[PDB]
């Protein structure tokens, strides 16, 4: 599996700063490349984190799984240490995707089919953001 943490056993202290209005779900890619969820950060908050050099993290909205950025990119890798800052922020979503997020947040999934919209938008709504998918995406880009 191409996207995985290296088992370095080299401690690296990190601050996860949630500079977003979302409840943030930190996700650690284990040594097999499996996403592992860690405790959620409410909006505006931070946590000091013990991780290790060569470990891979990404960050998502804990409720909807929408993609978040970290230091303006997709993946955060602790470096050699002073704690390293991981600034978690909203991406500039496409307007299409932001509209999808709002519609998803207002309509129960069983009622998407009752929206007066073209078929292809029902499907776009149903295709919820998904970590394992994003990871297949990122894996193929290599």
């Amino acid at each position: 599996p191409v996207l995985r943490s290296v088992n370095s056993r080299e401690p690296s202290q990190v601050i996860f700063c949630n500079r977003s209005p979302r409840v943030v779900l930190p996700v650690w890619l284990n040594f097999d490349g499996e996403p592992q969820p860690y405790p959620t950060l409410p909006p505006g908050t931070g946590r000091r984190i013990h991780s290790y050099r060569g470990h891979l993290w990404l960050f998502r909205d804990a409720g909807t799984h929408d993609g978040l950025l970290v230091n303006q990119t997709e993946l955060f890798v602790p470096s050699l240490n002073q704690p390293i800052f991981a600034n978690i922020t909203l991406p500039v979503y496409t307007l299409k995707e932001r509209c999808l997020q709002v519609v998803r947040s207002l309509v129960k999934p069983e009622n998407y089919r009752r929206l007066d919209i073209v078929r292809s938008l029902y499907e776009d709504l149903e295709d919820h953001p998904n970590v394992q998918k994003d990871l297949e995406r990122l894996t193929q880009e290599r």
Partner: protein, 88 residues
């Protein structure tokens, strides 16, 4: 440098060309080649679209904290349809 985007209900939105060009659809519609009509997008939607362009261009490639792009429930469906058509 500026282009005009006209809503279904006749409102005329004048935005920088570089802002408009974040719609691929609009980029193609510009090829009065500095004016484009949208007979399916009303003003309450096209105004929001233009706000999104400003938003996109200000905050794309910024390390500053990025604020939420707000969308009232009442326009979400139409804005979705417009966003989809405009490819933005």
């Amino acid at each position: 440098m500026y282009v005009k985007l006209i809503s279904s209900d006749g409102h005329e939105f004048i935005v920088k060309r570089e802002h408009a060009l974040t719609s691929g659809t609009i980029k193609a519609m510009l090829s009065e080649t500095n004016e484009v009509n949208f007979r399916e997008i009303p003003s309450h939607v096209l105004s929001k679209v233009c706000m999104y362009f400003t938003y996109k261009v200000r905050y794309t490639n910024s390390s500053t904290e990025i604020p939420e792009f707000p969308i009232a429930p009442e326009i979400a469906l139409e804005l979705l349809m417009a966003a989809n058509f405009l490819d933005c």
